[PDB]
Design a protein around this ligand. Sequence first.
Ligand SMILES: *[C@@H]1O[C@H](CO)[C@@H](O)[C@H](O)[C@H]1NC(C)=O
Lengths: 50, 48
Amino acid sequence: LTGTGVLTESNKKFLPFQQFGRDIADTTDAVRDPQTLEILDITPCSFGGV
Amino acid sequence: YFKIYSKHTPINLVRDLPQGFSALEPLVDLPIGINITRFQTLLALHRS
Ligand SMILES: *[C@@H]1O[C@H](CO)[C@@H](O)[C@H](O)[C@H]1NC(C)=O
């Protein structure tokens, strides 16, 4: 699962059958690391209008 | 694909089903690949 976003430590507690979490637009906003089983929020990188 | 969803709930009602809400989490996804049209559960006898 590829993407680009800021990774932060998450307060969500995934059930053991869950690997990722989806938002309204079905983009992965939370993911479980497959080596150390911890949850990370993925806030997107900042977007601006020049 | 044989999907097992499971939930354990502490209840204290005597006879009928309790009234409440409890979502069943998926436990085991089981690779059988066979036709199933009829089933039967297994009980245990008590001998004395
Ligand atoms: C290797 O991965 C498993 C689960 O994928 C994990 O439980 C284990 O801690 C990992 N080993 C190390 C040394 O991180």
